Amino acid sequence: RAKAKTRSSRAGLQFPVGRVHRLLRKGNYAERVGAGAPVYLAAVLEYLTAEILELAGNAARDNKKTRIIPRHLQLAVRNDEELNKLLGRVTIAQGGVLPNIQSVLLPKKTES
Amino acid sequence: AKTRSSRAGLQFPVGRVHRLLRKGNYAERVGAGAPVYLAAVLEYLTAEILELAGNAARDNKKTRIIPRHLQLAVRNDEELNKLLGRVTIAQGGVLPNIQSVLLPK
Amino acid sequence: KVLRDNIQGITKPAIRRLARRGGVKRISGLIYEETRGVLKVFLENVIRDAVTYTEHAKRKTVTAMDVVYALKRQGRTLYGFGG
Amino acid sequence: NIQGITKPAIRRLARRGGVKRISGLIYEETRGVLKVFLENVIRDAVTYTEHAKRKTVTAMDVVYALKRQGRTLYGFGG
Amino acid sequence: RYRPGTVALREIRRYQKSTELLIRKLPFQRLVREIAQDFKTDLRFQSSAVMALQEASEAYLVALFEDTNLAAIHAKRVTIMPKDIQLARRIRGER
Amino acid sequence: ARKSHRYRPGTVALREIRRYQKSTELLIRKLPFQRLVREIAQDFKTDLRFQSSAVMALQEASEAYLVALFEDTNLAAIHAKRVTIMPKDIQLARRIRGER
Amino acid sequence: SVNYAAGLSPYADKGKCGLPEIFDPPEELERKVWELARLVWQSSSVVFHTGAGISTASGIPDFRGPHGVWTMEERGLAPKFDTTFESARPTQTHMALVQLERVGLLRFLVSQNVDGLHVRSGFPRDKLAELHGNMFVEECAKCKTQYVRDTVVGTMGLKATGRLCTVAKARGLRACRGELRDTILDWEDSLPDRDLALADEASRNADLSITLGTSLQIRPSGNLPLATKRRGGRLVIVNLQPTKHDRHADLRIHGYVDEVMTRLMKHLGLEIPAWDGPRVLERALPPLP
Amino acid sequence: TRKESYAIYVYKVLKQVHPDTGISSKAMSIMNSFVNDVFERIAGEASRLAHYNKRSTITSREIQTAVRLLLPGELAKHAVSEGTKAVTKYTSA
Amino acid sequence: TRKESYAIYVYKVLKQVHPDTGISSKAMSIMNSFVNDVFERIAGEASRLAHYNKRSTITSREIQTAVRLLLPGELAKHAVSEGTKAVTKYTSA
DNA sequence: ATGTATATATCTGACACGTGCCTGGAGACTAGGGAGTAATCCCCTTGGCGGTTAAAACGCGGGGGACAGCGCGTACGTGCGTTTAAGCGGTGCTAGAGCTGTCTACGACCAATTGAGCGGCCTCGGCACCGGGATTCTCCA
DNA sequence: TGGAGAATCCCGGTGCCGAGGCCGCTCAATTGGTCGTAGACAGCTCTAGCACCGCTTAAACGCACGTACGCGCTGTCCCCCGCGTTTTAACCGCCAAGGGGATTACTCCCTAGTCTCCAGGCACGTGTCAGATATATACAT
Ligand SMILES: *C1O[C@@H]2[C@H](O)[C@@H](COP(=O)(O)OP(=O)(O)OC[C@H]3O[C@@H](n4cnc5c(N)ncnc54)[C@H](O)[C@@H]3O)O[C@@H]2S1
Ligand SMILES: [Zn+2]
């Protein structure tokens, strides 16, 4: 046989295409699975992961760290409307909540 | 008798349930006892909802069942209401009720 | 052919009837525009999903089953039109 | 055993939520709501565990229970 | 003449007993076609499709109005205002 | 660095809000909550063993649920022209959410 | 020339309004600038510190001096202004420092002023540390992307200005929509992360740092030249008013910063460019012989 | 092509429970949709249960667990009892 | 025991987008669970789309439609763009 | 002379990197059936017109409550000191979770058979619709 | 307390489109038999849940005091609501065109299934790096 160049390398991805193909086949989603379905699904998953990770890295920069923690993922998700809608029902563990304080609860200044 | 539905004490189609399970892309194999169970559960639930709807129809001086009767039956029973919380019955209307303060005093 | 500002078709008496069915005894004047906007948003979501289903199916007509599937996706399953 | 959820714990949860003042009668209602939520989640998880013929409630059983109730939980695998 | 408020309850009772479609069908169909024009051009809605859309919209609006009325009554009022609708939609995760 | 008696009732609460909304640690004592989970699961199946990760997952879920419920309760209380959340606020929030 | 006195916060514990404007004799000033020039000409790592005394020559008043805004706001009520940030004419010292960076003698610069005249003077942004901030700079809250504007953003207290981030990223990751907040620190607010880090690194590496036009009363900004002399190094404090660390000062001047810098350049044989508009430049210009 | 519906069996059940009552076409369609939806729910939950435990067959146990997980208390108990009765009467003969 | 996870690929993507930034084990677990959840959702929607059109296969068209249905806003647009680019590059090879 | 702050050193923890081991993925191959693709048919959607007419629109008056303000009681916030049980780090034990090994009961599949549920057929009635007679909160007095 | 009414519950007549039954049959459900394997059952082990204790000590609990808030009462005014007349367009009934959905052949390209080969991916080890804490020294009061 010739050199075994993985499907991901040909596609240009970073996520596995063979693994996602096997998950689709063994996942019992259809009697047969197309040859382009794993590539498309892997590309979509990689894009979503890259988006979350980029926003989490920005959050970690803002929080003055060099290592992503769950709090950074929660901040990256809840601060982006699209991801918040997509991840509305998730509860990221050890993520806390956004710093929201209602205006009415704030005190009234201009004293003295 | 010959038909699986007949051998069990059911009225729902066991053969159709088995065919749907096999063709539905649920598992590679489907046990021979699963269709009987699923058909029994479907028959029981249909019996319950139809019994409540028929009771509503009888209380509504109607000899038949209309979507409104089904809606009243579903909403007036807590267990089914929790079961069917995210469903809307076309032409079923809304359960009659008014707030406790808007009434005349 | 290009329909315009048909949201006004939802008249004040219609929203009032909907409110009365919902158990409301008194309705503010500002309620009507808000209700029209909410209805528009809901319809946009449902119609977007239905049109996506239709376009995937290679069809050019929005079958009732498309609307039923769209409602089912958004957790508002509808009984009485198939599915 | 329910009283293990102390008043300071509920006050801290409210402060995390954003609450500024808490009526004295909130605490019992919060305990009841917590009890109902835990009852539902634990019932689903224990049903999952019993199905798999296990005497131990694995974490993945709790994750699946939460997913069933529309409360998918990340960070515990699955 | 009737003192104000008494016939509001009569309309509530009448429109809760009945089960017809409150919104007029033709304006709703025009609204649906206008909405659909945004996504894809020259669709062809089946009559059953627009009936399903109308049933779904009416059920959604009735439920939203019931929640809005509950919110208004909680606020020590009898009249529903836009803020009650905003509260009801926010507590339900919408918007 | 930055750029540079009795407190009025209301400022220490704001300090607590600022403190607890910027942290991530669970806000319930682990041992009492674990005992509560065991007691609740007792009514279903006896001699039921819990993984530590299972109890932690339950605690995280319950903490998130209660924080969200309290957020909605505070919004409801503010809607009613108030600052102190009352049980009626919690009941209204749950009723609108669909859980009640 | 809007004042950062009420804009920051009502709380202002300056406690400094009697400031005798001591001036040095011309001969003693000449000798002191001479010794400063002798030291600086051979010192390699030289980092500067410009405060709100440089831009007084431009026209925007200082803060602590007799004409300082806080001084007038404390003793009665008479805030006088003449110019505006948009019309702010750069002082000769700004271009002098630009030339110092051009020839490479100026290792770094850590300013604390707010007009951003150094940025508008063409000083490489990678070499500056606007600790307190800059009006002509608005940074994206989300991705910490910084935008140089030719018009003042017009906001105080690190608040949203009304414009959304307009930069994009690789791989198809969506273009950002950050709030684009402003850069000026209110009292009890954090400093800008790695700008402060770079300032600390430069001052520690600085074997000779001179601090100009600042009273050094303020947080860190006045403490960097303390660290410039710890672990070795000499500190030259060129300021009219008695600074908070004159006891620790290894040198002192009582004269106009413009005059002393001009004498320093004349002794060094160095010339000065002649201002510009908002000719902003970021990348460090190559060193000159 | 001819379509498939549960109309006949819903009719039979209605006659068994209400021997003197009819049903409208709309109500029959609603009942058909309800039966389809409940069947889909139970089957999907059974499939997930089988997949979680690495099984490959949806046996009666998977269906029982799914119907216990979906329906509320009394409804689930009655449904599971009737399913067990049906399976017992089927396998026995 | 042989456990499967997307950890290596997530780490590779992170190092591709953030050259100097680590990721905690807990954060990695959250990301792996997120990938699993999104994969399951998209695959299930694709399966239902295939079943509705009486098709017995899943193709890039079904995945694209599922992505359109699930992801909101610009997220869906860019996800479809990336998937289309990936599929066209793969087919070209 | 003492106290506090900062700097440096050391220790611990976590993780990125390195390594061997193995099994799941890639290349080459064949067979058959799922679904493209074209042709044809006709069901249903769009579109129009016209008449009656049910409901929307507009105006007008009044009266109900939304909302603001003011005053009183007390319930919660904040602080302090005393209690107590959570937290952590030890051991010590063992229920059972996970893996392996073996074998058989069972589901898939196939051939052949037949029967029951569906499309189109007709017949009969439930209640929407109409006429009037008697009844219940509203409003007024 | 009482008295007139708009709207509502209810009795009698009844005929049409929808519910209900008939029936031929054709594809799907049923019976019998073959074969491979997915899972039933039994064993082994050793991971980790569980139980208990002592010391630290962070947090929970009880009380005291005061003020900030909730709650209630009262007074505009203004903003809905109810009613009556105009009018605006829905609704229905019918008819035409034709697009597009639905079914049917031909087929051909794509994917399931196999087999062989082997690098990518995981388990484990490790060492290295980073962060946090503690101690010591220097400076200031
Ligand atoms: C937040 O932002 C503000 C900003 O960052 C600085 C402003 O104060 P400093 O620059 O730290 O000190 P400053 O008040 O400027 O002290 C300098 C003194 O110098 C006198 N002065 C005016 N003109 C001068 C020339 N040409 N040469 C020498 N000295 C000169 C001023 O009168 C002043 O006393 O911190 C705040 S807080
Ligand atoms: Zn940005």
Author numbering:
A (entry chain C): 11 to 122
B (entry chain G): 14 to 118
C (entry chain B): 20 to 102
D (entry chain F): 25 to 102
E (entry chain E): 40 to 134
F (entry chain A): 25 to 28, 39 to 134
G (entry chain K): 2 to 290
H (entry chain H), I (entry chain D): 29 to 121
Text from the published report:
Sirtuin 6 (SIRT6) is an NAD-dependent protein deacylase that targets lysine residues in histones in the cell nucleus, where it helps maintain genome stability and links metabolism to epigenetic control. SIRT6 prefers acetylated histone H3 incorporated into nucleosomes, distinguishing it from other sirtuin family members that prefer free histone substrates. This specificity is attributed to recognition of the nucleosome acidic patch by its unique zinc-binding loop and interactions with nucleosomal DNA, which position it to selectively deacylate histone H3 (21, 22). While SIRT6 erases H3K9ac fastest among the N-terminal H3 acetylations, it exhibits robust activity against multiple acetylation sites, such as H3K27ac, and longer linear acylations in vitro.
